Design a protein around this ligand. Structure first.
Ligand SMILES: CC(=O)SCCNC(=O)CCNC(=O)[C@H](O)C(C)(C)COP(=O)(O)OP(=O)(O)OC[C@H]1O[C@@H](n2cnc3c(N)ncnc32)[C@H](O)[C@@H]1OP(=O)(O)O
Ligand SMILES: CC(=O)SCCNC(=O)CCNC(=O)[C@H](O)C(C)(C)COP(=O)(O)OP(=O)(O)OC[C@H]1O[C@@H](n2cnc3c(N)ncnc32)[C@H](O)[C@@H]1OP(=O)(O)O
Ligand SMILES: CC(=O)SCCNC(=O)CCNC(=O)[C@H](O)C(C)(C)COP(=O)(O)OP(=O)(O)OC[C@H]1O[C@@H](n2cnc3c(N)ncnc32)[C@H](O)[C@@H]1OP(=O)(O)O
Ligand SMILES: CC(=O)SCCNC(=O)CCNC(=O)[C@H](O)C(C)(C)COP(=O)(O)OP(=O)(O)OC[C@H]1O[C@@H](n2cnc3c(N)ncnc32)[C@H](O)[C@@H]1OP(=O)(O)O
Ligand SMILES: [Mg+2]
Ligand SMILES: [Mg+2]
Ligand SMILES: [Mg+2]
Ligand SMILES: [Mg+2]
Lengths: 127, 127, 127, 127, 127, 127, 127, 127
């Protein structure tokens, strides 16, 4: 189906294969999911193309491990994933993403700016 | 000066709301929908019917802004019924150089022709 | 320099007067009718059959001015019979800027191919 | 700068000489025939089958000059059989001003693909 | 300034790998295959099915480089099944002078979408 | 159906709904219709797009409450409605429309001029 | 059928109607036909568009009353009629047409010149 | 089928007819074939378009009588035939073609150069 943002609470074996490609450094299910530790993923034609982890603390929210598969970058996937994360957590009024793991901090900043985040020491904020 | 034919824009999975042999010409489309996909009044459009498999070409006329109407009119009403799910596309031509950086206007619909998303690119299908 | 394909003109609901496999090529049209819709001798035209649903493309030739003839000739005569009600259209290409203000040549027919009305625009379909 | 689509040339009532699903691409035409109708190797052509009514589009390749071959090849061989009588046409685009004085290249065939006549105009059909 | 429509490139006898009504749009093609035939993401393409005879037009999207995927998606999946052998073509327009010396990008496939040969010309069919 | 001018002698419930949109200020059937007080309406695809009231006094005729729905203006509807009113009351040799209720007297004058009426104090005349 | 030159030895009622239009000044069958007084006619889609009378005297041959219907002039009909007359009377080595009845001697001379006749006093000759 | 390079070990009657056209100077089967004297041929739509003789002596290999049918030259056939000969005799590290029989030594040298052969006295070499 068309590009869709989903919250993954349980993982199929396809999901497991896809998440290994998106996140080679992590071993599912080292990945914990509960009500405050979320994983959102972009799904397109029964495959995941991008993922991010979300940590909620009421009005504060942290983002880490945002990654879009190299093959499908600059097609708006990253942006749609993040907007759906913001939109579906309307309780959060302050978001943080630390610059950890980021390949290319220059690209990340231009992306986070398009989405309205301000660059700060160690990260990006929208708050 | 080789000229390519490029997808200009599409309405993805709208529902036919009216179909009548006795109406004039030949697909009437809510104004807002035309704007979202960059489609013009009197422009040639192709219609692909997901419900019944038929593929046909016609031209677009305006329907009242906000009506949500997809009206398949005249001879075309042999090719679609009320409630069919269709994709509506138009195509433009441009030099090869411009074609390599072209981004189509794409609009996504759910339920009763509710526009869910506009975008400028289709993701890459992965294995 | 994006180029659009626009409805140039149409003959709305003419009646086929002759159809014969043995005639040469491929839709002969009363001269007056061609002029009314801005259609040229040897121009590509699309024919949509309201009576039987068939949609096919051919090219126009002239028939004697004032004869009222719509003659569907050669291979095309597999697609229409004497008395069928058809719509005949042609399409032209022009830059997007011109396309936004384009007005098609439209001609309306009743009874025995009596031209009732010419116009330069199709109204908006309302709810 | 409105651009028209005009019949460029046609081969009128040639006989299919070969048809085979296993051949490559997609209509091979005697060289002399292509020249007579101004049709180019690799050009898009439309084929209208008078024998069975099918209308399809493909592209032309050369067959050996003087062979008289009309070979309908690959997927197209679903649309025609050996001995079918077909019309082969191509279309070009040009400004409206040139279109009003355009004369197509027309070639007429009888018997075993014997070229009987070339001409530059189709007569007017009279009552 | 007469403009011809020329075969730009083709994928000759690829195998459909996926077909699904529920996928988005409308033929996803391995990246490497698009490059080999000079076909662009979002370009209009024609698909000719050798297995079942169907001929339809759509537009191309990218699939992951090296996947070998030919995915026939959405409404088009009414026109082809998994394992069908198809030819995929695109067409461009250029002035007559350039058309007389044009060479198409052609790619040949065998077995499980293994690219066997690229070339710039189709031979002449001999008697 | 195509754009048609009709004299309304009886009103359906669709007619009532349509006339409320065309004339929010009037309450059907406050609207009296007899042989000398007429209402003509423009009908397009089973809806009314414009209306006008006609008062006849033999060789003199008055027009009031001419209105075309905002959504479908400048598509020739107003002009066709008025021509059909003039044409179908060939006994009237002198017509008057008072400038009462008119939103934009500047637009009205340019319209009434296109139709051959002269601007006068308090109105337009053709006589 | 396509444009064909025929020798008329017997006349149908269609032929009689057609010849009255081509030759209003003559009353069929005032028209005598035998082996030396011939009438050749151009036929297109079961109608005659042009006619000429031929008088043979062995190696000498006279032409009179050459006329093409006004509606279909300058489409090559006149030229094809004359070539078929010359070609099918290969015994005649000297042809004459007198300038009698000719509307526009200027047009006639340019035509007879295209066909290789020389202008002479009272006529044209090819000999 | 598409253009294919084949090693001919036995000859059909079609092969015999084709080889006479490619090689009028030789009389099949004057032509000896064993494990060290080979004939490779280019086949396209069940006909041979080009042939060459190959003599193997372990790491040394001789080529003679390379000819492509005149009608189908400059379409890449000659080049593909030679590449398939080289590729399918990967034991040979030194190839020679003598300039015997060659029509146009100038054309031959440009061809053999495209394929990476060096011109030498009496021939071409790649070694
Ligand atoms: C274990 C771990 O995962 S640690 C975390 C590691 N993550 C990373 O290293 C990030 C690697 N990079 C990525 O994943 C992607 O490149 C992302 C998320 C930065 C961007 O995702 P995309 O889907 O490619 O971006 P998208 O196309 O949605 O971009 C939207 C906007 O961002 C901006 N943008 C994105 N990429 C770029 C770029 N390369 N240069 C400039 N601007 C850019 C543009 O404004 C763009 O809008 P446009 O296409 O209209 O110009
Ligand atoms: C209770 C009551 O109803 S009180 C009466 C209230 N009525 C009003 O206030 C009138 C409101 N306006 C309207 O209803 C419409 O704008 C009308 C009747 C003036 C015009 O109807 P339309 O259907 O829009 O006009 P139409 O397209 O037929 O115009 C024909 C010609 O009029 C002229 N015209 C119309 N609108 C304009 C304009 N806005 N500017 C310049 N010329 C115009 C043009 O010559 C036009 O021909 P073109 O399109 O070839 O240039
Ligand atoms: C009782 C009786 O019938 S009395 C005899 C009366 N007959 C007449 O008065 C003749 C009236 N005129 C005619 O019938 C026609 O105009 C004819 C026979 C002169 C010409 O017939 P057509 O079918 O129109 O001519 P056709 O198109 O075959 O012309 C061939 C060539 O003739 C020349 N030609 C024809 N008409 C013209 C013209 N009007 N001006 C210049 N050249 C012309 C051109 O070279 C043309 O070739 P082109 O189109 O490649 O330029
Ligand atoms: C008994 C006997 O048979 S004796 C042997 C007799 N043989 C001969 O006399 C050879 C006659 N000539 C031929 O058969 C052909 O012309 C050949 C074999 C030289 C070439 O075969 P083709 O299939 O025509 O060549 P092909 O199209 O594969 O050429 C590949 C490259 O060769 C070069 N080439 C081929 N022909 C030419 C030419 N006429 N001029 C310049 N370069 C050429 C070009 O680089 C070309 O690539 P391009 O089309 O990308 O420019
Ligand atoms: Mg992306
Ligand atoms: Mg209007
Ligand atoms: Mg003529
Ligand atoms: Mg070649």
């Amino acid at each position: 189906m068309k590009l869709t943002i989903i919250r993954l609470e349980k993982f199929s074996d396809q999901d497991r294969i896809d998440l290994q490609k998106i996140w080679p450094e992590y071993s599912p299910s080292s990945l914990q999911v509960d009500d405050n530790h979320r994983i959102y993923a972009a799904r397109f034609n029964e495959r995941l193309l991008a993922a991010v982890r979300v940590t909620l603390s009421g009005t504060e929210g942290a983002l880490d491990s945002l990654r879009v598969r190299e093959v499908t970058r600059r097609r708006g996937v990253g942006q749609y994933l993040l907007e759906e994360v913001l939109r579906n957590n309307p309780g959060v009024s302050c978001w943080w993403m630390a610059d950890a793991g980021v390949e290319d901090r220059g690209v990340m900043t231009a992306f986070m700016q398009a989405l309205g985040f301000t660059a700060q020491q160690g990260g990006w904020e929208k708050c | 000066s080789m000229i390519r034919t490029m997808l200009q824009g599409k309405l993805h999975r709208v529902k036919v709301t009216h179909a009548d042999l006795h109406y004039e010409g030949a697909c009437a489309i809510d104004q807002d929908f035309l704007d979202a996909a960059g489609i013009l009044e009197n422009e040639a459009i192709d219609i692909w019917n997901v419900t019944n498999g038929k593929r046909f070409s016609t031209y677009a006329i305006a329907a009242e802004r906000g009506s949500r109407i997809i009206s398949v009119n005249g001879a075309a009403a042999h090719c679609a019924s009320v409630g069919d799910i269709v994709i509506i596309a138009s195509f433009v031509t441009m030099p090869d150089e411009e074609a390599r950086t072209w981004r189509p206007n794409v609009a996504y619909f759910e339920g009763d022709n509710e526009m869910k998303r506009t975008a400028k690119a289709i993701p890459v299908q992965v294995a």
